[PDB]
A paper describes a structure:
Ferredoxin-NADP(H) reductases (FNRs, EC 1.18.1.2) constitute a family of hydrophilic FAD-containing monomeric enzymes that deliver NADPH or low potential one-electron donors to redox-based metabolisms in plastids, mitochondria, and bacteria. Structures of bacterial FPRs, as well as those of plastidic FNRs, are folded in two distinct domains: the C-terminus with a binding site for NADP(H) and the N-terminus binding the cofactor FAD. The genome of [name] pv. citri contains the fpr gene that encodes the FPR (XacFPR).
We here report the crystal structure of XacFPR at a resolution of 1.5 Å. The overall structure of XacFPR strongly resembles those of bacterial FPRs from subclass I. It is organised in the two typical domains present in the ferredoxin-NADP(H) reductase family. The N-terminus (residues 4–98) folds into a six-stranded antiparallel β-barrel (β1–β6) capped by helix α1. FAD binds to this domain, near the N-terminal end of α1 and the carboxy ends of the strands β4 and β5. The C-terminus (residues 99–259) adopts a classical nucleotide binding fold with a five-stranded parallel β-sheet surrounded by nine α-helices. Finally, a chloride ion coming from the crystallization mother liquor is located between helices α8 and α10, at the C-domain, stabilised by the OG1 atom of Thr193 and two water molecules. Finally, in XacFPR, the exposure of FAD to the solvent is limited by interaction of the phosphoadenosine phosphate moiety of the cofactor with the side chain of Lys259, probably introducing structural restrictions to the enzyme catalytic turnover. Here we describe the first crystal structure of XacFPR. This structure shows structural features that correspond to a protein from bacterial subclass IA but with detectable differences in the mobility of specific loops when compared with other known bacterial FPRs.
Numbering used by the authors:
A (entry chain A), B (entry chain A): 4 to 259
């Protein structure tokens, strides 16, 4: 059920976040935005947790973007992985963060906090994302400036993607947000959207249910707050996988 | 001079050939087709050898395609590398296998035997290769059918390259050759070209110095034989790096 894959590269962003890549089974297929069970072998039972696949389905490796919880059963150990180590990966990806469950639209907003950024790494590398949308707004809301992950990638490297680059300079807009200190965009994503600061910064029109589509991935609080905002502006959720709406959303984690 | 990189993936083709990938230094730049010194740390002095870079310069990792010599000082050890191991990689790539040293042409023939295939893995992934040529003929001459490396990649996977695929189906022609047993294309590359079997199979015209360009990488014998053939047909070699000709060539190894 859970075959081992091998850890390739590992990068630590902060004391709380790190990324890693693994090998990918020949028969492993997924839709961009989906999550899969991953984990570790132990002295007893394997430790297994849901993780977004932070890479596109056309890519040769898998990537994961992970929290580090000091006493978390999985991540207390996962944080110490090294190239060559084994990480268990499931066979059955699933999840709600699918552009196929978004009604036709013009602007695609990817609203993520913390590790909620993970599925966006997949989505922004899907060619179909750009076939369907005029603008793709990539966000990450974090606490401090130093917490922003993949910043150089988004700001410098991705606009040079030998293959996606030309399109990305035209369509991909990066909007980092920081809560706990002064910054160009200071606040929760809900607050930056509530008074239209996000749209003003990006040069986009006031939110409109006919035009704007959302994918939302974050804390229980951010999901509740953003859903309340969008619902109050006339946006309708996708009610289940396979049924389209103006937005889709998925818990980045649960407060256990 | 020789910083360590980390081994990522390893694949054994036969008892005599294997491939591996490594991390790449942020400041490491190269022209497609070039070689670099690589090697291993030891109990004394590092073991260092010239290796073609078997990947394109736009890619995030390096790949190498290696012989296994039973009592070879480097490869007796290199064959046992595992994910996570360190491989030394030089800073100063060089070499003659540069499309920039080919006069304008129509068809690009990549004539390789054994590990001579390595630089072609770089060249066939360079977008500039296809800007400059109507057809790219990818060869590997080997002894037995089972020795052909990357066969599924060339025949099945590469024509589906999410980004290079459309172009490759149009322009990339794979021509495997085998000497020691019956096969669609049986013989040395020199022999398959001497009587035009290669051109007939591929549906290309008789060799013509105005139109056909060659990059040649292989054994001392194959280089001598192919140069004699091409020279007798009026093709002129590039005399040095930076001065263009109808063909370029480089030793895949030396008989020590
Ligand atoms: C659909 C889904 C997708 C998920 N995708 C990811 C992902 O891409 N990356 C990832 O790191 N985790 C993801 N998670 C959370 C993940 O399943 C684990 O909870 C996480 O690996 C921590 O495991 P643990 O055993 O160390 O801590 P656990 O005992 O699961 O969690 C303990 C506490 O850690 C905190 N926590 C757990 N995960 C996070 C998190 N991601 N961000 C902030 N705080 C967290 C919460 O306070 C939680 O109560 C996802 C969860 C679900 C349900
Ligand atoms: C410009 C250049 C590029 C090279 N690129 C590559 C490359 O991409 N991949 C690679 O494996 N080697 C390549 N080589 C050969 C390489 O430098 C080493 O010789 C090889 O790694 C074997 O090292 P060793 O110490 O094990 O054997 P060494 O003592 O170097 O060689 C001993 C014997 O092994 C045989 N041999 C060595 N290399 C090969 C080979 N590649 N194919 C068939 N027989 C060989 C010869 O009989 C040689 O006399 C290249 C050499 C040069 C000069
Ligand atoms: Cl929020
Ligand atoms: Cl030959």
């Amino acid at each position: 059920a859970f075959g081992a894959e091998t850890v390739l590269e590992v990068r630590h962003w902060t004391d709380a976040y790190f990324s890693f890549t693994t090998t990918r089974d020949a028969g492993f297929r997924f839709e961009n935005g989906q999550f899969v069970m991953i984990g570790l072998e132990t002295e007893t039972r394997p430790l297994l947790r849901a993780y977004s696949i932070a890479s596109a389905n056309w890519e040769e490796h898998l990537e994961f973007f992970s929290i580090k919880v000091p006493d978390g059963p999985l991540t207390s150990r996962l944080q110490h992985i090294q190239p060559g180590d084994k990480v268990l990966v499931g066979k059955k990806p699933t999840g709600t963060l699918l552009i196929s469950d978004l009604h036709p639209g013009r602007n695609l907003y990817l609203l993520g906090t913390g590790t909620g950024l993970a599925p966006w790494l997949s989505i922004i590398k899907d060619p179909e994302t750009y076939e369907r949308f005029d603008k793709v707004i990539l966000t990450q809301g974090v606490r401090f400036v130093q917490d922003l992950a993949y910043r150089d990638y988004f700001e410098r490297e991705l606009p040079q993607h030998e293959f996606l680059g030309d399109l990305l300079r035209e369509k991909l807009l990066y909007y980092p947000a920081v809560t706990r200190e002064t910054f160009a965009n200071q606040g929760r994503l809900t607050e930056l959207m509530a008074d239209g600061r996000m749209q003003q910064t990006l040069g986009l029109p006031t939110l409109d249910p006919a035009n704007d589509r959302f994918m939302i991935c974050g804390s229980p609080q951010m999901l509740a707050d953003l859903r309340s905002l969008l619902d109050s502006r006339g946006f309708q959720t996708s009610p289940r996988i396979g049924t389209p709406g103006h937005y889709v959303f998925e818990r980045a984690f649960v407060e256990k």
